[PDB]
From a paper:
Of them, the most active variants, αsA1 ([name]-[name]-[name]), αsA6 (F46L-C258A-W263M-I280T), αsB5 (V27A-I76T-Y97W-Y99F-L130P-L226V), αsC6 (L72I-Y99F-I122L-L228M-F229S-W263L), and αsD6 (V27A-Y97W-L228M-W263M) were subject to kinetic and structural characterization. It should be noted that αsA1 was obtained in a previous engineering effort, and that four of the five selected variants contained a substitution of the key residue W263. Overall, all variant exhibits improved catalytic efficiencies against all tested substrates, with the exception of αsA1 with malathion (~2-fold decrease). Interestingly, variants αsA6 and αsC6 exhibit enhanced lactonase activity against γ- and δ-lactones, while αsA1, αsB5 and αsD6 show reduced lactonase catalytic efficiencies. Although the active sites of the improved variant structures superpose well onto the wt-structure, all selected mutants display altered loop 8 conformations. Changes are subtle for some of the variants (e.g. αsA1), but are large for others (e.g. αsC6). Because part of loop 8, including position 263, is located at the enzyme dimer interface, altered loop 8 conformations modulate the relative orientation of both monomers. In the case of the mutants characterized in this study, the dimer reorientation yields significant displacement up to 5.2 Å (e.g., αsA1, between equivalent carbon α positions), as compared to wt-[name].
Phosphotriesterase-like Lactonases (PLLs) are appealing candidates, being natural lactonases endowed with promiscuous phosphotriesterase activity. PTEs and PLLs belong to the amidohydrolase superfamily, and share the same (β/α)8 barrel topology. [name] exhibits high acyl-homoserine lactones and oxo-lactones hydrolysis abilities, and promiscuous, low phosphotriesterase activity. [name] is a very appealing candidate for the bioremediation of phosphotriesters because of its unique thermal stability, and its ability to resist aging, solvent and protease treatments.
Residue numbers in the entry:
A (entry chain A): 1 to 261, 271 to 314
B (entry chain D): 1 to 314
Amino acid sequence: MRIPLVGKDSIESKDIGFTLIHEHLRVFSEAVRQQWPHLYNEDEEFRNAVNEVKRAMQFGVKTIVDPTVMGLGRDIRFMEKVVKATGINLVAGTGIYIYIDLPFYFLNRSIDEIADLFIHDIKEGIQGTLNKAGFVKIAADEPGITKDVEKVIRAAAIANKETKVPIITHSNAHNNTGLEQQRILTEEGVDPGKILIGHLGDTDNIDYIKKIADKGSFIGLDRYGLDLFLPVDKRNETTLRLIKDGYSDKIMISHDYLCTFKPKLAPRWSITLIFEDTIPFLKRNGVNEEVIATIFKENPKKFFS
Amino acid sequence: MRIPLVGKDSIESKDIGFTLIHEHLRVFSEAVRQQWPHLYNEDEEFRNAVNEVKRAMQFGVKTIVDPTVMGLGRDIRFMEKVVKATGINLVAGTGIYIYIDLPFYFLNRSIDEIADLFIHDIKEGIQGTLNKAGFVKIAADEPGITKDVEKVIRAAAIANKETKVPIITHSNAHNNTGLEQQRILTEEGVDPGKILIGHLGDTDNIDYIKKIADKGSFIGLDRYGLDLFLPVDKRNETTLRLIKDGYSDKIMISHDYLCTFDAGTAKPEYKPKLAPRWSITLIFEDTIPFLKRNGVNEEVIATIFKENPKKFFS
Ligand SMILES: [Co+2]
Ligand SMILES: [Co+2]
Ligand SMILES: [Fe+2]
Ligand SMILES: [Fe+2]
């Protein structure tokens, strides 16, 4: 009745339950895979995604939000297959993931034309299916807010205003891209509480994280396990600090795990690391179950309502 | 047998006949087309491509070389359908068309791993078929020779050295990228005669063009009809001058026609001020008649359109 799900009837936000807000079943570069299909093994990809998702569900995860969009190899049919094999609630999105320029398709195309693509996926369905997009994903990274990155951001704001679906972002935690995304969306009329600024858990700069939260958006502590960006124990210290300072109303936690899509870079990276390490860490440091529920149930409910 | 053809037995290069060295049956952004198929009408693309190819064949064209590769929507199965509807000799390629950065697949991958993809397409076949690639296509434009652009350039060198297929380039005629491409490839051991430096017809700077040709490479006068890069009359004037100064044996001419393109610019849609007479047969309607009435004999026309493509693929 409000949040579309891959391969199922849409649900009211009250039924989302325990959510992993940012996880990927599979990512790839569309052009590479179309051109050199011998590099990929779909059977293996499917088997690893299904296993990872089953494991999450054994810890009580009900819904996964998967922000694989254009540029990351969104495949709605693969997603459907995983949903049939697992029973997971899966929220698919629309959007564009670029760091510099858009594909040449977009040359002399307006922001509204871009937004029309997102709205098509939200109102009509994704890739020829009746599976509808539940959110818009956008990105910026080390190159910053380029001209084309900015067009995409503005297009996301149009789609949100027209359809009410929330916006998930990718940012670089160390160069202000997050704060800029929030600002441009917000200036374009997006409710700050319909934005999740992503990858803030990549830094232990608490003042920058709070800045974005205090402007009204969710803060993505969303790469647990990617030690190369920030080690688990430092993420844990940051999370705990934010909870202790009263920020659990804006915290969202996830792994950004690539289910099929490393001893030094990400030794215990998986879709269940927060059950194995983070949540027990927090509980040992005095965080109650009510806070856990706020982060993994209440916050996603608010984001999608 | 020595040039692979899509949907046909390979041909000796001496049999290639009258050739258009750089034309596209269809181009698109793979990511866009994968994510928003509602934007594209395959029927219309197929009908347009077939119509263009048949009209080129009526003018005597035997062979078309199509440098649509990764980044431009190469689709060997579409190409097969076009061959089967027309009987054209079609040469498909491999390569990577980027202006700035490689797709994220290539993060922390070596130049060799890039080359192996090219070698795969040339020795094994394209996209799971046995249609083999006959050349490598690479690109550089306004952003210049970026690090990833250079990785692709060096990958093409390795592929040529291993398989012997020639290299076609896309360049920006106004920023030296063509000469940079030639430089880096010749440094890596590629024979200059196996390189076509593209889009040099986009300038009337005759001295730049000549510099590349004197270094031993073919020069692509290859966007006839794309008036936004350079109008037909200035292209014709440049082409003629090069032929008079003795450069016939290095000149290749084409239209770079996109029988179907997905960009919004779209150089011919309510916007045919950018490319009014642009089609795959414009050289038969304008350029060849112009050369012929300005002292260029049938021999020189045969050199450009038959002999040079034959050498390039030998
Ligand atoms: Co991200
Ligand atoms: Co080109
Ligand atoms: Fe992600
Ligand atoms: Fe081209």
